[PDB]
Amino acid sequence: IVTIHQEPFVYVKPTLSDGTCKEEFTVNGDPVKKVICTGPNDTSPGSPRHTVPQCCYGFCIDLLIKLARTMNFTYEVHLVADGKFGTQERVNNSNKKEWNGMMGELLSGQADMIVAPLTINNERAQYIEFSKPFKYQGLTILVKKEIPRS
Amino acid sequence: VFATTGYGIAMQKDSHWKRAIDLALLQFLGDGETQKLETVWLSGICQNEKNEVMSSKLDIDNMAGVFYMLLVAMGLALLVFAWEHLVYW
Amino acid sequence: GSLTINEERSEIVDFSVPFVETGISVMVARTTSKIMVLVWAFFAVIFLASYTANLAAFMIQE
Amino acid sequence: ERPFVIVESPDPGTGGCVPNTVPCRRQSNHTFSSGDVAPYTKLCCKGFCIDILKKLARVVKFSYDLYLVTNGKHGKRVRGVWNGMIGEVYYKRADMAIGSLTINEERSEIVDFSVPFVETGISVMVARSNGTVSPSAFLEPYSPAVWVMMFVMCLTVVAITVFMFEYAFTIGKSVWLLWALVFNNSTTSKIMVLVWAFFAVIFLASYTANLAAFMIQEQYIDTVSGLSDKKFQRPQDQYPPFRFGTVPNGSTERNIRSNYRDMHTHMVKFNQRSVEDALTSLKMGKLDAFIYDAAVLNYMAGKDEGCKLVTIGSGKVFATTGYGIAMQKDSHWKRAIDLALLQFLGDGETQKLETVWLSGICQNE
Amino acid sequence: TLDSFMQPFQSTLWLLVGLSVHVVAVMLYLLDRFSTLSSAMWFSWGVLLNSGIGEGAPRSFSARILGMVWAGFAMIIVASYTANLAAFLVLDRPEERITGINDPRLRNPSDKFIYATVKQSSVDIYFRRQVELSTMYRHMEKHNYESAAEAIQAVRDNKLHAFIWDSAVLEFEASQKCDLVTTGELFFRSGFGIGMRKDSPWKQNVSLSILKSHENGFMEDLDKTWVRYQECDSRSNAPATLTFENMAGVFMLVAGGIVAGIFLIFIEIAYKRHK
Amino acid sequence: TGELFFRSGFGIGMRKDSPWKQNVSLSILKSHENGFMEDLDKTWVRYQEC
Numbered sequence: 004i005v006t007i008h009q010e011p012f013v014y015v016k017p018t019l020s021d022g023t024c025k026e027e028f029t030v031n032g033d034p035v036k037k038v039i040c041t042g043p044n045d046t047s048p049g050s051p052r053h054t055v056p057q058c059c060y061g062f063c064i065d066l067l068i069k070l071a072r073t074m075n076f077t078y079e080v081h082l083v084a085d086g087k088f089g090t091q092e093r094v095n096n097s098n099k100k101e102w103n104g105m106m107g108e109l110l111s112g113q114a115d116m117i118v119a120p121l122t123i124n125n126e127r128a129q130y131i132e133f134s135k136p137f138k139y140q141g142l143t144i145l146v147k148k149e150i151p152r153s
Numbered sequence: 154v155f156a157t158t159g160y161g162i163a164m165q166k167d168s169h170w171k172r173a174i175d176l177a178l179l180q181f182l183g184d185g186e187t188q189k190l191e192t193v194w195l196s197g198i199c200q201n202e203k204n205e206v207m208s209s210k211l212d213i214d215n216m217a218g219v220f221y222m223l224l225v226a227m228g229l230a231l232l233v234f235a236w237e238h239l240v241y242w
Numbered sequence: 243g244s245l246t247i248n249e250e251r252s253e254i255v256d257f258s259v260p261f262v263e264t265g266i267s268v269m270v271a272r273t274t275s276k277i278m279v280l281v282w283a284f285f286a287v288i289f290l291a292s293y294t295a296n297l298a299a300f301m302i303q304e
Numbered sequence: 305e306r307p308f309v310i311v312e313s314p315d316p317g318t319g320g321c322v323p324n325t326v327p328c329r330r331q332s333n334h335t336f337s338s339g340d341v342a343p344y345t346k347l348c349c350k351g352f353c354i355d356i357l358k359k360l361a362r363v364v365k366f367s368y369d370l371y372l373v374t375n376g377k378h379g380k381r382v383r384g385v386w387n388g389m390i391g392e393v394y395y396k397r398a399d400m401a402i403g404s405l406t407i408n409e410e411r412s413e414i415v416d417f418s419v420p421f422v423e424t425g426i427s428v429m430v431a432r433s434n435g436t437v438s439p440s441a442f443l444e445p446y447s448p449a450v451w452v453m454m455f456v457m458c459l460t461v462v463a464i465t466v467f468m469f470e471y472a473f474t475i476g477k478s479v480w481l482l483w484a485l486v487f488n489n490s491t492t493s494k495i496m497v498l499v500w501a502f503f504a505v506i507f508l509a510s511y512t513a514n515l516a517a518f519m520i521q522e523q524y525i526d527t528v529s530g531l532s533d534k535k536f537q538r539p540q541d542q543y544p545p546f547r548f549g550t551v552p553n554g555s556t557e558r559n560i561r562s563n564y565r566d567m568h569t570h571m572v573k574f575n576q577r578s579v580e581d582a583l584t585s586l587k588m589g590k591l592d593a594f595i596y597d598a599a600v601l602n603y604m605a606g607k608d609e610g611c612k613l614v615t616i617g618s619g620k621v622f623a624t625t626g627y628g629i630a631m632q633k634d635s636h637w638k639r640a641i642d643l644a645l646l647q648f649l650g651d652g653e654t655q656k657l658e659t660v661w662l663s664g665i666c667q668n669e
Numbered sequence: 670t671l672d673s674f675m676q677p678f679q680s681t682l683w684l685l686v687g688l689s690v691h692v693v694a695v696m697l698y699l700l701d702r703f704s705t706l707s708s709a710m711w712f713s714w715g716v717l718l719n720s721g722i723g724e725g726a727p728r729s730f731s732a733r734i735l736g737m738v739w740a741g742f743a744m745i746i747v748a749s750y751t752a753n754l755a756a757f758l759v760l761d762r763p764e765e766r767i768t769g770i771n772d773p774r775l776r777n778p779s780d781k782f783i784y785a786t787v788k789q790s791s792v793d794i795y796f797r798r799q800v801e802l803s804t805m806y807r808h809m810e811k812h813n814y815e816s817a818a819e820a821i822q823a824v825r826d827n828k829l830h831a832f833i834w835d836s837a838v839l840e841f842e843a844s845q846k847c848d849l850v851t852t853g854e855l856f857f858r859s860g861f862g863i864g865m866r867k868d869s870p871w872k873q874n875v876s877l878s879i880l881k882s883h884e885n886g887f888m889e890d891l892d893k894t895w896v897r898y899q900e901c902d903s904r905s906n907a908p909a910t911l912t913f914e915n916m917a918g919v920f921m922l923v924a925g926g927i928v929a930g931i932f933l934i935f936i937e938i939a940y941k942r943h944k
Numbered sequence: 945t946g947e948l949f950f951r952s953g954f955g956i957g958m959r960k961d962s963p964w965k966q967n968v969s970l971s972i973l974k975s976h977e978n979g980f981m982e983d984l985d986k987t988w989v990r991y992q993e994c
């Protein structure tokens with residue numbers, strides 16, 4: 004499985020010294036599920052790479068628990084390599100364009116499933132096989148608030 | 154909306170027509186050509202309109218809160234009567 | 243036509259990508275001592291003019 | 305013109321001017337004719353068009369002097385012989401003309417033209433956008449029918465009360481109290497005056513309510529839209545926006561002489577002040593709407609202090625055209641110049657040359 | 670307007686202060702006399718009304734707190750009246766009649782805003798040639814009118830909702846009669862002209878004299894003789910004026926005060942003085 | 945600022961020639977009726993207002 008760090012869907016937290024990330028309880032005192040994540044360098048802009056186990060929990064990870072429970076699965080989770088989602092771009096001084104980022108690691112063969120906020124459009128639909136949508140949304144602009152003077 | 158799903162085109166199970174028109178439909182939405190078609194048949198006069206006739210004050214919702222604060226203040230005079238008289242005699 | 247996607251239908255007949263979203267909805271019908279007391283009276287009239295204007299605009303909110 | 309070229313007194317401290325500026329000779333015949341007049345004064349020229357001229361000399365080793373046009377502005381074939389800048393080319397008084405020269409078919413016959421270097425259009429500019437209320441008199445919140453009834457039906461309790469109290473209170477004193485209480489300043493006398501005081505409060509609060517309704521549902525004039533607006537195509541009007549300036553002998557003077565004479569008949573109120581001196585009339589208040597090309601208008605819309613709003617803009621255009629440098633007849637310099645603009649079209653100096661002379665500095669909030 | 674004295678407060682809280690003045694009324698003649706009954710009755714019933722009827726001040730040094738705050742209760746109630754009345758008057762929007770021919774009212778003519786043209790005219794054919802305006806024509810073909818004068822009378826009598834027709838005639842209509850408004854500007858440009866059978870001898874001369882008259886200025890100057898603007902404009906930019914209906918109810922209560930005084934004074938004094 | 949000027953959706957992704965394609969697309973639809981996707985909305989994208 005390939006996953007990306009997006010605020011409300013997939014959280015990423017450093018693990019405790021013992022290896023297991025510390026437990027916590029929600030507003031109703033119910034155990035929130037967490038899974039152990041390998042993957043990123045823990046240093047995106049200031050080092051080449053070196054992997055380290057971490058902890059994940061969120062929307063997509065919660066659905067994967069319910070999804071795999073019915074399917075009788077055996078799953079491992081590893082994050083993306085270089086953050087970016089994916090696009091088609093001609094590599095430096097070559098013949099044809101090849102896929103980028105998260106989509107690349109699945110088409111190459113490094114993973115068999117993407118559980119992440121991936122959109123639906125024509126360009127990606129050529130080479131990948133999607134599923135029925137599990138959330139609807141759009142595009143909006145975020146701006147800074149205006150002071151209500153006095 | 155509850156239990157959100159969508160409309161579709163029902164076709165025979167395991168057919169060879171699926172992939173062809175699946176990409177065609179994704180082409181339509183991903184270009185805005187469905188927006189022009191959507192604004193011709195799904196349009197209403199008061200879509201962007203909302204104006205309540207009134208919320209007539211002939212109802213005890215906020216003036217009632219004022220009314221009972223007056224009763225609270227009204228009891229202060231009775232308490233002051235005992236305190237003022239007893240402390241002065 | 244106006245055909246919806248759900249559990250049982252998708253079991254026996256294939257489907258395409260949804261192009262119009264929908265769901266389940268509910269619809270129902272629609273001296274210096276007295277110079278200060280002058281100041282207090284000055285604040286009282288402005289406070290009401292502020293109050294009634296503030297409530298009136300809050301009252302105009304559909 | 306205002307934005308494309310600018311002329312000034314060069315530098316009162318050095319005779320010349322600040323660098324990146326070229327001196328030019330100008331002839332102004334605003335004096336008498338007794339002996340002679342020599343108005344050729346060493347001014348200096350700064351602007352966008354000088355940059356283009358200063359950028360072609362560095363390419364084709366051009367050499368030049370700069371002389372102004374002896375009269376108002378551009379011309380057209382009228383009465384048989386032209387009049388204006390083009391005449392200096394036709395009458396062998398010059399060789400080439402540079403600046404805001406809109407390309408056209410009425411002048412391409414008698415002089416050639418090169419490829420344009422801009423994307424301009426024609427738009428309408430109106431006076432400043434202002435928000436002001438329109439209460440004529442403070443007595444508006446009631447129709448005059450209510451006032452007279454209010455005034456007279458108030459006078460009957462004036463007489464009735466003293467009749468029910470005299471059978472003490474002076475006859476003259478009673479009328480004073482009645483007026484005073486309704487203006488909030490001051491069982492035989494109490495019963496009627498009690499609800500009578502209520503008569504004041506019940507309607508005096510409605511006056512506030514009504515004036516709170518006048519100042520909300522009112523609105524200002526809509527700052528009327530482009531050419532096809534209802535105020536223009538009906539030229540029978542003496543107090544509309546009453547301006548159709550359309551500077552005399554201009555390029556746009558011929559455009560309003562194409563098919564419909566309903567416009568050229570009322571466009572006779574033009575003012576000969578070339579651009580700027582007649583432009584301030586739109587800001588002064590004696591001129592309402594002035595029609596010209598959008599190139600020199602948007603820069604004047606933004607760079608000018610305050611706010612003076614042009615029409616819709618890139619959408620409010622008609623007959624979009626471009627400005628180009630003209631090649632005189634029987635002069636094969638076209639190949640030399642056409643390479644220059646096309647080369648300047650490729651390297652991308654159009655933006656750099658624009659942002660140093662044409663930009664939006666301080667847009668209105 | 671409607672129910673001046675009854676629109677904002679003619680319910681539970683309207684009679685609240687009617688008895689909320691009585692509870693404090695008796696509660697003062699028993700707060701001072703027990704360490705005048707009319708004095709407290711007239712005072713509170715007057716201070717709420719801000720009348721200049723001076724009477725007994727609160728004698729008790731402790732009773733002065735309720736009166737100084739009873740005015741505040743009276744000070745707050747009438748303010749809520751003013752704000753509420755303004756909101757009702759603002760939201761009485763008279764009309765948002767129509768835009769040009771793109772409004773959703775035009776496209777879907779269920780029953781409201783039926784629009785009719787003159788049968789067999791140029792407009793009725795243009796609406797049959799445009800492919801987009803198929804439903805718009807499909808509603809107009811059901812019913813129309815025979816003459817232009819018929820449509821003007823029907824619209825003025827409010828039997829027909831909207832009327833689509835030529836602009837030159839319609840512009841002269843609204844300006845002169847002044848009961849009518851042109852809905853914006855034109856959305857289709859065309860022209861007039863003489864009509865002659867094909868290959869007629871005068872097809873060249875008559876066309877020539879029209880061009881000559883335009884440059885001459887006779888045709889342009891003739892229009893003023895038959896086309897003009899007068900007596901009616903964009904006025905009525907004031908969406909209210911209090912009618913003689915709500916004030917009449919306001920005039921009604923003052924009449925009740927007159928009848929109450931004369932009847933009671935004549936009748937009650939006769940019984941009271943005699944005994 | 946304002947409304948939204950485009951409409952799309954999310955979805956799981958799997959390579960071409962996948963056996964789980966038919967089955968996972970059923971669980972996603974099956975969870976929508978049971979209100980499972982509704983409470984997940986109420987868990988950690990809602991009920992967190994200021």
Ligand SMILES: *[C@@H]1O[C@H](CO)[C@@H](O[C@@H]2O[C@H](CO)[C@@H](O)[C@H](O)[C@H]2NC(C)=O)[C@H](O)[C@H]1NC(C)=O
Nearest residue numbers: 073074075962963964965966967968969970971
């Ligand atoms: C999708 O789910 C269905 C239902 O669980 C699976 O169908 C079963 O497959 C097993 C595998 O051999 C059979 O033993 C069962 O008999 C099947 N069910 C029925 C009702 O016949 C199906 O295999 C799943 N898809 C995949 C790719 O495994």
Ligand SMILES: *[C@@H]1O[C@H](CO)[C@@H](O)[C@H](O)[C@H]1NC(C)=O
Nearest residue numbers: 071072073074075076077078
């Ligand atoms: C799931 O897979 C395991 C193999 O790891 C198998 O033993 C089991 O029968 C399968 N089904 C269930 C319901 O666990």
